[model samples]
Target: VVGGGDLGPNVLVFDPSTPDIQGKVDEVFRKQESNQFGTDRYALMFKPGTYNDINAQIGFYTSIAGLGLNPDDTTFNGDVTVDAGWFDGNATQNFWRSAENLALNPVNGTNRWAVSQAAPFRRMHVKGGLNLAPDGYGWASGGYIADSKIDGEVGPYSQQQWYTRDSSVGGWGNGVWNMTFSGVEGAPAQSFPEPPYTTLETTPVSREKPFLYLDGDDYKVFVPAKRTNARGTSWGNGTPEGESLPLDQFYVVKPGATAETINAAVDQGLHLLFTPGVYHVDQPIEIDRANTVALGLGLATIIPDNGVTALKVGDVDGVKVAGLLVDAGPVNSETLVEVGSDGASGDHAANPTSLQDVFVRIGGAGPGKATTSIVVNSNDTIIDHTWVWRADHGEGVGWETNRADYGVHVKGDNVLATGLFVEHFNKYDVQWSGENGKTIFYQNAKAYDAPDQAAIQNGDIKGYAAYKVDDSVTTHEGWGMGSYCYFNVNPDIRQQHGFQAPVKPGVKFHDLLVVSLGGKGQYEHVINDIGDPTSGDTTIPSQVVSFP
Candidate 1:
């Protein structure tokens, strides 16, 4: 009962019982070229039914929405074809003919379609090619394609052919959610591959109870007071005719406390309280006490004025260092912090320690054996909200036995690191020993200005899960997911290890953004699959948001 008079030239509402709308659909495309009559307000609704023989080229700014169309009730019965000559509109013709014109032209052209305010639901199918010019851009705000197929024959010629100018420019514009693609195929060299599985899920993490909190625009720790002796009296033997008393010990360290005094106080179980000034030290400040917290004001300003490590925790438990800007010495060859057991006497294994809100910067040229910025050797520890800034001459950060220096190195279990920013390092940004470690979580971390070497080195880790890296940069590793991520070859200055992908074991990656500006080789982002039986199913939550 559907009549031709009920349809307009701009919009075609295809319903289940409509006899034939192919001729009317052809008229819509014919009018688009003649009068330039495409607008964003044009809405094409496909109801629950099958409309076959839909071979035509559509080159107008139109919105195609499936209105009340379910996959079980509606279908595109035959192959829908799109001819290459159909993009003969004035604006599309100029884009395909000249690359320079498309770049310098205005935003709105004849073939430009903007779907800013359209919400197309599921049950849609297109069986032909959807081609964009070498310099064209297509945008879709919100839509769903379930059990459908889009067979594009365009190769990877220009950035516009794939419609991805940069990492930020490509993909569905306003975020695609719950869109399913099954049995869909693309051209030989096309960039976007169809989803491996049909269903898409989201994961969310809780941000309550932060490990570090700011106190009145500055960082501070809440330290408990210690028991003290009574005024001017000793603990056991008093000369005041049997007057035995105890006095409360103050927890604050005065501004100009010497290294010997601080070390003595630390040995006596007195937690150091530092304000906003720089504390210069000549030797390594070792932490030998349990239940201690060394706090700093912020990441950038709290300076350490010496060549030795600013803080070192050796053979201790229940220790937490937070919110300290531990900088290297002015000489340019010393470490900021070293934490491990001295191989000779101390029986402390590098296990069970935590670092939070710490900024480590190395300086001076000492023996390469003493240049580590935060070495760790404890288990059940968490390092969160840390930034390591490296100078031009030294390795930025390390976590292994280098002559005997370890930078945030641990040989324990149940360790978590989140929100780390490592930049401008001379050597590796973050290194790990793949030997004898498991259950490590690295979330929302970044490494920038790294050399051709590996950004992250894992010696031998097993049963690892929930390792997330999103929105990060690497010179090598371009952008990778899971384990063993590295960069491609540099186009400008070719090195020996230029084009080989590093081997990483037992890692899972999601939504990694990589940009290769200087490399001549084709940039590749790989998700490495290490050979392990238990490596695959580490069990990350299904509703987690990727780190950004």
Candidate 2:
């Protein structure tokens, strides 16, 4: 029973024996036009007992703390079901304005909401739903919600919307700690760990040399003009030349090899480049090497010519596959790429210690066995510049299943993913169920076009981060983080996440843009400074930059 002040940061205590609990709680915000605490912060501590229909529309910067009795007995119970209209109308506007004010003046730190440390313990439940403009941003910074539930059954818009419409937009700097759940659901639960605290580290070779450069829509591979005084000079030699691998060393897969020969070639450390032709593979193509770069030229279309994985890199390090289009094409349940440990007696028995980069599409066949796309059982892997388009029949992608059916699934340490677009999948996108990793970074990515009731799930133990670029848009569940790095969106529309980081995190988004045209014409518009902020200024209508 904590009470005070007109613009009070009130703390309300709720117990089982408290008399007229509902009536007294109802009068909690009497002078307020809305049910929210009106920019005046308030904390409500609920005891372990079900208090039904404790509906309240919390105002901006409001904090609700549920007290846990003890270490083992620390459980708070009560259902705070906020009505749909509460956040949609006046409440939403107030929240938006509050965020705007915080952006204008850096009062309580860099982010939007700053919760108190003595705020409450775990075991809380938030049933029902909260509806905003569907575009408004509701933030929770630096808090713990353990064994709690937030079930959001909102609309066709971005589910967990985070971002403002102002020219000076702010990024999602929210922090979540040790949150568990049962039936908690919503539009992509976008979240991110605090920045600079977690980031990517580039390898020595990658740092000293440039591999590829982006020119318009094409990637040009460049070799160093001058040779350095280090050991290992030319290709095939053991010299540390800057960029010495010539384009000729990169060979295309010839048609003369059978499945046996292809497997043998992959074993010999050959750079098997695939051209734009349907290469048939009856058996799985096993890859085991450190410097093998099997690139699919121009989205090289490869069908499991013989009902097997088009490309399988088993427990290999430094393996990279890019621009390959893998169509499981009516296979029983064959995967596109299968990355696993050496065997049962290996270090990666359940969790392998290897690295691979898979950038391509995995789709085909519906409602059948042998229908997983990319399955990984290794750690320190990077899956980027890839798109996982869903097939009509089977589950879209999975992580650490009985047969290891994860789309960019990782169970080891230090895994990163970027530029991953998952669409029209029948199951979860980016499933992290194994709970063995140190970190998972999802940058410049999206999880759009999911079937109803599908999960974009993550069950991490250490931490994970999901980043969105300027033009990136998520039509489904955004991201879920366990120990850290839940969701992060770039404040600028022109630049991508980690633009400043030297060794960019595996998952990164660059230059995201969103536009909507209404019946009255193109009325609403928003753009961040990641690029040209004045590009779409309303005052100078005719000065718009036309796309070629």
Q: Which candidate number has the best TM-score?
A: 1
lDDT of 1 by residue, 447-475 (tens): 22233334223333211111222112121
lDDT of 2: 0.31
Superposed by TM-score, candidate 2 places the C-alpha of residue 189 at a distance from the truth, in angstroms, of: 22
What TM value does model 2 have? 0.37
Relative to the true structure, how large is the alpha-carbon lDDT of every model?
0.32, 0.31
Per-residue lDDT over 1-548 for candidate 2, one digit per residue giving the tens place of the 0 to 100 score: 11111211243556556776666545643422243212233334344444443443333223333322211121222223222244442222232101100001111211112221111112222232222222343322222122222233322122121211001111122212211111122212322221111111221111111132222323233332222121111221223233333334444454334667666766654555554344557776777775455643222345565456766776655565544555554444456667665232234222222221233334322222235566555555544334444432234332212121334433333343322333322233344422222222222222222211123322321111122121121111112221111111211122111111112233332222222111111111211112222223222111111111
TM-score of each: 0.40, 0.37
